């Protein structure tokens, strides 16, 4: 998917182009991943902002019920976590193993992301 | 702390006893939490009323700069949010991640608390 490809590579202009030509912002991979999942996991803030502006679901879940916030948390993408937080992402959402994004942060040793979410997440 | 313990468990009579024997209503934990933080987070309205009556700071901030209203909001304790509101709690107060209690409500999917604060919070 070209929307997934450009978002994954941080190709903002390409992503903007794909969405312009009618690319589907919430199109999902075979694993249930959306372009916002990749942008947030790879730390592509600009692309994530584009997707969010275009209307992409900030709380989209993949086949493991992981949201873009799980992706940013587990890969330690602090700027992306912050973006998700100011666009009302659900921080208490659990994946299939009953883990919230702050849990995934901890498990992946992303302690700076844990320190941020500790301020906002009430579990 | 016995004032924290009783408040946390909803032990009104015990809390009243602790404050009677000179327990410190605004004593804080190692995390900067007061007994009112626990009462509000656990939804212990009676205990919260006791603390407030005894003079406890309705706007006390913990180490993450979260107030009792952040605690009631994030855990969806509507009755406690209402109590805080009629005792002049500051609804625009931001924590260390620049989030007000209505922001924390939203992030924690406490939509009924969001609907209440929408009526009073001007941001």
Curated annotation (Swiss-Prot), chains A, B:
It comes from Arabidopsis thaliana. This is Ankyrin repeat domain-containing protein 2A. Disruption phenotype: Lethal chlorotic phenotype when homozygote. Reduced levels of chloroplast proteins, including outer envelope membrane (OEM) proteins. Defective chloroplast biogenesis. Reduced APX3 levels and reduced targeting of APX3 to peroxisomes. Compromised peroxisomal function leading to increased sensitivity to aminotriazole during seed germination and shorter hypocotyls in darkness in the absence of sucrose. A 1,2-diacyl-sn-glycero-3-phospho-(1'-sn-glycerol) binds at residues 75, 77. The gene is AKR2A. Interacts with TOM20-4, CYTB5-E, CBR1, APX3, APX5, TOC34 and GRF6. Binds to chloroplast outer envelope membrane (OEM) protein targeting signals, as well as to chloroplasts. Interacts with OEP7. Binds to HSP17.8 via its ankyrin repeats, this interaction enhances chaperone activity and chloroplast binding. Also interacts with HSP17.4A, HSP17.6A and HSP18.1. Binds specifically to two chloroplast glycolipids, monogalactosyldiacylglycerol (MGDG) and phosphatidylglycerol (PG). Exhibits chaperone activity toward chloroplast outer envelope membrane, mitochondrion outer membrane, endoplasmic reticulum membrane and peroxisomal proteins, by recruiting specific proteins containing a single transmembrane associated with an AKR2A-binding sequence (ABS) and subsequently binding glycolipids (e.g. monogalactosyldiacylglycerol (MGDG) and phosphatidylglycerol (PG)) present in the membrane of the target organelle. The lineage of its organism: Eukaryota, Viridiplantae, Streptophyta, Embryophyta, Tracheophyta. Ubiquitously expressed at basal level. It is found in: Cytoplasm; Nucleus; Plastid, Chloroplast outer membrane. The ankyrin repeats (ANK) mediate interactions with hexoses-containing lipids present in organellar membranes (e.g. chloroplast), such as monogalactosyldiacylglycerol (MGDG) and phosphatidylglycerol (PG). ANK repeats lie at residues 1-27, 31-60, 64-93, 97-123. A 1,2-diacyl-3-O-(beta-D-galactosyl)-sn-glycerol binds at residues 4, 27.
